[PDB]
Design an enzyme around this catalytic site. Structure first.
Site, PDB file in Angstrom:
ATOM      1  N   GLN A   1     -14.870   3.954   6.630  1.00  0.00           N
ATOM      2  CA  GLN A   1     -14.917   2.669   7.302  1.00  0.00           C
ATOM      3  C   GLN A   1     -15.153   1.547   6.295  1.00  0.00           C
ATOM      4  OE1 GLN A   1     -17.928   3.305  10.383  1.00  0.00           O
ATOM      5  NE2 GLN A   1     -16.285   3.964  11.765  1.00  0.00           N
ATOM      6  N   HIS A   2     -14.814   0.329   6.706  1.00  0.00           N
ATOM      7  CA  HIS A   2     -15.058  -0.886   5.929  1.00  0.00           C
ATOM      8  C   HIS A   2     -14.232  -0.939   4.652  1.00  0.00           C
ATOM      9  CE1 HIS A   2     -18.950   0.349   7.954  1.00  0.00           C
ATOM     10  NE2 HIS A   2     -18.480  -0.629   8.705  1.00  0.00           N
TER      11      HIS A   2
ATOM     12  N   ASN B   1       0.834  -1.188   0.000  1.00  0.00           N
ATOM     13  CA  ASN B   1       0.000   0.000   0.000  1.00  0.00           C
ATOM     14  C   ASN B   1       0.873   1.243   0.000  1.00  0.00           C
ATOM     15  OD1 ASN B   1      -1.797   1.875   2.366  1.00  0.00           O
ATOM     16  ND2 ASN B   1      -2.483   1.597   0.254  1.00  0.00           N
TER      17      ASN B   1
ATOM     18  N   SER C   1       0.438   5.377   0.265  1.00  0.00           N
ATOM     19  CA  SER C   1      -0.536   6.377   0.687  1.00  0.00           C
ATOM     20  C   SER C   1       0.132   7.594   1.308  1.00  0.00           C
ATOM     21  CB  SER C   1      -1.520   5.768   1.682  1.00  0.00           C
ATOM     22  OG  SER C   1      -0.830   5.271   2.813  1.00  0.00           O
TER      23      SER C   1
ATOM     24  N   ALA D   1      -0.321  10.601   4.347  1.00  0.00           N
ATOM     25  CA  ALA D   1      -1.027  10.901   5.583  1.00  0.00           C
ATOM     26  C   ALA D   1      -0.099  11.729   6.414  1.00  0.00           C
ATOM     27  CB  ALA D   1      -1.429   9.660   6.318  1.00  0.00           C
ATOM     28  N   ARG D   2      -0.629  12.803   7.004  1.00  0.00           N
ATOM     29  CA  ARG D   2       0.201  13.810   7.635  1.00  0.00           C
ATOM     30  C   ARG D   2       1.016  13.167   8.730  1.00  0.00           C
ATOM     31  NH1 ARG D   2      -4.877  16.795  10.722  1.00  0.00           N
ATOM     32  NH2 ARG D   2      -4.331  15.996  12.799  1.00  0.00           N
TER      33      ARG D   2
ATOM     34  N   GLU E   1      -5.515  22.420   8.432  1.00  0.00           N
ATOM     35  CA  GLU E   1      -6.029  21.481   7.450  1.00  0.00           C
ATOM     36  C   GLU E   1      -6.724  22.082   6.229  1.00  0.00           C
ATOM     37  OE1 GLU E   1      -5.898  18.538   6.480  1.00  0.00           O
ATOM     38  OE2 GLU E   1      -5.058  17.352   8.118  1.00  0.00           O
TER      39      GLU E   1
HETATM   40  C1  LIG Z   1      -9.615  10.628   3.266  1.00  0.00           C
HETATM   41  C2  LIG Z   1      -9.027  11.672   2.647  1.00  0.00           C
HETATM   42  C3  LIG Z   1      -8.273  12.721   3.423  1.00  0.00           C
HETATM   43  C4  LIG Z   1      -7.946  13.911   2.802  1.00  0.00           C
HETATM   44  C5  LIG Z   1      -7.256  14.878   3.513  1.00  0.00           C
HETATM   45  C6  LIG Z   1      -6.893  14.657   4.832  1.00  0.00           C
HETATM   46  O1  LIG Z   1      -6.190  15.648   5.531  1.00  0.00           O
HETATM   47  C7  LIG Z   1      -7.220  13.465   5.449  1.00  0.00           C
HETATM   48  C8  LIG Z   1      -7.913  12.496   4.745  1.00  0.00           C
END
Ligand SMILES: C=Cc1ccc(O)cc1
Ligand SMILES: C=Cc1ccc(O)cc1
Lengths: 501, 472
Positions: free
Chosen positions: A190-191, A168, A170, A172-173, A283
């Site tokens: 979810q799911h 995977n 991805s 993510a902060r 954000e």
């Molecule tokens: C699930 C998408 C997503 C987009 C931006 C963010 O800061 C967290 C999740």
């Protein structure tokens, strides 16, 4: 012969070539100063800052490239930076960029190929654990009142199942916690399948291997941005876009494969039981709200590698327009158009206006198709909502707006005109009470709805009722659409002759 | 010396002085071409066109001044044309213009002064009944599919009880003798190029123009009745209004941006019986449609003035009011003082109900279909801040209160193109965009942009060094 989609440094090069990059060679404090400059550049659609001279940086670690997917002036192509991620003509429109992403989904998936270590820039310098000192990196402090320094705003997390057959990628902060640890907040519908469930099943939830990669091939960082279907592989799809296998090498301390030309790679272990507070962050909706939210998993960094004069790419979210509107919004819009085509919905295009902070999804409806359904606003809006809100595609979306095919949904002037004049407030909106809420939406997280996390979404009908049945001829009362072509042409021709500049 | 508030021709002159007026001297067809040139100008906030050479015109009748309250570039003062209607400095912000209009309610009303025919420029030429042929005038045909040529879009109707009402309302030429207006022998006057302060006051009163000007409006009696008309009008139509005699007022492109086609309804017929006008008369014209024209700029700001007055009188903790032009005057935005709101000890549900009742059960809220409440960190005169607040600070549907029993604005397209058009009731709402905690206490968050997200000083430091970094 430059290939911006494949090489982060080529992407940097084309921006320079197009007078869309400013090499800032004077000392800039990673504390607030970098984020402020980025914010000014974002808001007036100015060229991207490359901070080559950060306070506290060693020769190699690091420079910062800000705003890798911001907008810029029209003449250069305003979505030029997004187009370079996919290797497209820089004057490609966002509509065409989205269509191209769907086209790539028809291409044959192309798995990554392993290349030699001695050729791979990301292996140029290699650090063992004892030399890991995250607090001596010029990690940017991006917003006032941020819970900490955010190293990971535009890199790629790489994780794998224990049996190594689901990888995977991805974004993510990721906030630096201390000299060895990072904590990242993941927000997902979810799911859907979790990488962690694989390791928690065989009892190793405390030592899940990870890689974090910065300055990866730009197609990759774009593809790992948002909501690719459950079956499809991330890497194999980036390959189809590149028309070539992503070049990868193995990590020093584990079995993960990282992109060979990454600027920086951090390796280590995450623990689901060992948690840390992940203090707030500015954000995508434009706020830093105080309060650290529920503890996130702790990530232990045990090794890293990087190239000479490494560059950390950074996204600094807030008010429109930044990466969280332009990548995230367009990727959702792409999946939304795809979902529409598979379901037979008469949908021409889909977009998430940057002015709505990626909370609005506008669906442009083909009226002839709509009419063939012989349906009603009430039926159609429910049908649209179930499809999108009870699915992973509508996760971040809180309002879906339906408009006829006379509206250019990529132009917000037209969208706001249709929204306001074509729906009765409340009576033409359909609430969805029991679907999953997007936890980040300020009206959600700053209300009791943050506990229930259900509802607060709606489908708004901006199609006149008559347009559900037959052709409905009205005049749009502006200059380009109100008057015969030719009168328009003549007036434009004579415009300077009249006296206008 | 120039007094643009008092005199139409001084208004035209201050626009020229400011390079905000283009005298178009080549031949221009009143059929569509005037309208399209106006729309192009409105839509790019460009100088007003003065058409001096209309196809079909006589020497006196007439030129057209388009876009008399359109917007223009920010450096000249974007709301300059509105400020000249009030005699304000042309760089006055729209907030200051709204505040000035409220202030005028404090001033002494000066009744209009009668002046003798010899000193009234509108009396220079006088036409008796037999010489009236409205169809010979170079009246503009403004939009495709309009039901007719509209002579009256920016002039003033005057009516008086048998022993005084100044109104603006669209008017369509029906034949050589008849005009029909949107709503047995009732006298009327129809005046064009009135004092600019007058046309602004009649937009949503004669004595109150006096309070704006600080002096009296020069008036003079009509030739065929007792109505007093502005001495310096460009043109004055006089005649008889009948309610027994009706005509289909064919459709007209309107403030929300549509011509809805073949849609009409019977309206009272005005019979023109006399006319008078000055040398080289000018007809001011307003061509409504997409933002931004007079119907957003004049109508919207007069509604905001009243809305702010209504708030003050009611004890509502309201700082400012505005109707964003991008929302086509369907949205009223109210800026709320949070200390005030907190001193009220109220809840979203109670406050929204109270705000709605005050506004929607009144003639002030008439044209407004959505009222938006925001905290006082939002500059409501900047639509980039408004749409940000609207989208992120209210829950769709759940943070919205419908009012179904109040009077609908008939022109609203979602009203007129639905069954709600036979009732004219409902379809309005108040939308709470104030975070629930802001009703209770101080709620400090960071606004993540450049100017507000960072300590000024850093903002100034970056603004200084911007050129030195490499930016332009
Ligand atoms: C699930 C998408 C997503 C987009 C931006 C963010 O800061 C967290 C999740
Ligand atoms: C009363 C306001 C109003 C605005 C425009 C129009 O055509 C009719 C009425």
């Amino acid at each position: 012969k430059l290939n911006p989609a494949l090489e982060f440094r080529d992407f940097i090069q084309v921006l320079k070539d197009e007078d869309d990059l400013i090499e800032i060679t004077e000392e800039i404090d990673p504390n607030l100063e970098v984020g402020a400059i980025m914010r000014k550049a974002y808001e007036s659609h100015l060229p991207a800052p490359l901070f080559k001279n950060l306070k506290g940086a060693s020769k190699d670690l690091f420079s910062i490239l800000g705003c890798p997917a911001g907008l810029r002036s029209k003449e250069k192509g305003d979505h030029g930076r997004i187009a370079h991620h996919l290797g497209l003509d820089p004057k490609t429109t966002i509509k065409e960029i989205i269509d191209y992403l769907l086209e790539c989904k028809e291409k044959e998936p192309l798995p990554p190929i392993t290349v030699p270590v001695s050729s791979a820039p990301c292996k140029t310098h290699i650090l063992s654990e004892e030399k890991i000192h995250l607090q001596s990196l010029p990690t940017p402090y991006l917003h006032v009142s941020d819970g900490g320094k955010y190293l990971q705003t535009y890199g790629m997390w790489i994780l794998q199942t224990p049996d190594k057959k689901w990888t995977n990628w991805s974004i993510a902060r990721g906030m630096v916690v201390d000299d060895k640890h990072i904590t990242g907040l993941v927000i997902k519908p979810q799911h859907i399948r979790q990488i962690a469930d694989s390791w928690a099943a065989i009892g190793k939830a405390n030592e899940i291997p990870f890689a974090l990669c910065f300055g990866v091939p730009p197609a990759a960082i774009l593809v790992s941005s948002m909501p690719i279907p459950e079956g499809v592989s991330e890497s194999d799809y980036v390959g189809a876009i590149l028309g070539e296998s992503v070049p990868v090498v193995k990590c020093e301390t584990n079995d993960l494969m990282v992109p060979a030309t990454s600027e920086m790679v951090f390796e280590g272990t995450l623990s689901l039981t060992d948690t840390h507070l992940e203090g707030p962050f500015g954000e995508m909706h434009g706020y830093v709200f105080k309060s650290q939210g529920h503890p996130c998993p702790l990530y232990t960094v045990k090794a890293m590698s990087y190239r000479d004069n490494a560059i950390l790419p950074v996204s600094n979210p807030g008010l429109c327009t930044d990466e969280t509107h332009t990548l995230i919004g367009s990727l959702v819009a792409t999946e939304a158009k795809e979902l529409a085509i598979e379901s037979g919905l008469p949908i021409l295009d889909a977009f998430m206006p940057y002015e709505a902070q990626a909370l609005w999804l506008i669906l442009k409806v083909d009226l002839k198709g709509l009419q063939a359904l012989k349906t009603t606003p009430e039926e159609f809006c429910k049908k649209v909502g179930d499809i999108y809100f009870r699915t992973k595609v509508g996760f971040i979306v809180h309002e879906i707006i339906l408009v006829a095919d006379d509206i250019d949904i990529f132009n917000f002037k037209e969208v706001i005109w249709a929204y306001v004049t074509r729906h009765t407030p409340v009576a033409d909106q359909m609430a969805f009470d029991d679907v999953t809420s997007f936890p980040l939406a300020p009206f959600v997280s700053q209300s009791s709805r943050s506990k229930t996390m259900k509802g607060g979404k709606c489908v708004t009908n901006c199609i006149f009722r008559q347009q559900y049945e037959r052709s409905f001829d009205y005049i749009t009362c502006n200059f380009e659409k109100g008057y015969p072509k030719g009168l328009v042409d003549k007036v434009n021709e004579n415009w300077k002759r009249y006296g206008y500049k």
